[PDB]
Every structure is written in C-alpha cells, then in structure tokens.
Amino acid sequence: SSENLTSAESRIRDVDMASEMMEYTKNNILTQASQAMLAQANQQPQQVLQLLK
Amino acid sequence: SSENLTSAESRIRDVDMASEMMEYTKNNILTQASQAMLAQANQQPQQVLQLLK
C-alpha cells in the first residue's frame, strides 16, 4: 500500500521531466522572438528624423 | 512404541533436507534476480540528464 500510494502521489505531485523541458524551451524561444522584435519596434520611430529635416 | 512414535514425531517436526535445500536455492536465486534488476532500475532515471542539457 505504500508503493501503490507513492506511485499515486508521484503522478499527482511530481513533474514530467520530458513534457516540462519541452515546454520550457518553447517559452524560452517565445521570449527571444519578442526580444528580437522589440529591438526593431524601437527602430521604427527613428525614421521620422530624416523627414523632419 | 518409541520407534513408532520417534518416526511419527520426526515426520511432523524434522525437515526434509532435499525438499528444503532445493527450496532454499530457489529463493537464493530470486533475490539475485531482484538484485540484478534493482541495479538497472536505478540507471533508468539517469537518462533525463542528457535531455535536460
């Protein structure tokens, strides 16, 4: 009854290493995609200076 | 009446050497089979490290 409950509690509490590392990598890329586009988002307002002169 | 009772008591109390040595060897192997698989059971969780990097 300890094995059957230890296994029962592990499924509820312990994390799946495979299904979590794969999900961590996804959000670790989605933040770099937003990081890359944030840099370009700041460059866009810089083009009105050539028009203002 | 002592021989007939000594033989009667030996069957009840004394062990059969053949039928017991053969049974001892069986459990002496079943514990080594579990010993061998316990070593491999510990190696299985070690493979997530190559995935985590």
HEC string of A1-53 equals: CHHHHHHHHHHHHCCCHHHHHHHHHHHHHHHHHHHHHHHHHHHHHHHHHHHHC
Inter-chain CB pairs, A–B, below 8 Å:
7
* 3-state DSSP helix/strand/coil % of chain B, to nearest 5: 90, 0, 10
Task: Give the minimum alpha-carbon distance from A20 to chain B in angstroms, rounded to a whole number.
Answer: 10
Q: How far apart are CA A17 and CA B46, in angstroms?
A: 12
Task: Give the minimum alpha-carbon distance from A34 to chain B in angstroms, rounded to a whole number.
Answer: 23
Q: For tokens 């203002």, name the residue.
A: A52
Q: How far apart are CA A25 and CA A43, in angstroms?
A: 28
Residue B51 near residue A18, CB atoms below 8 Å: yes
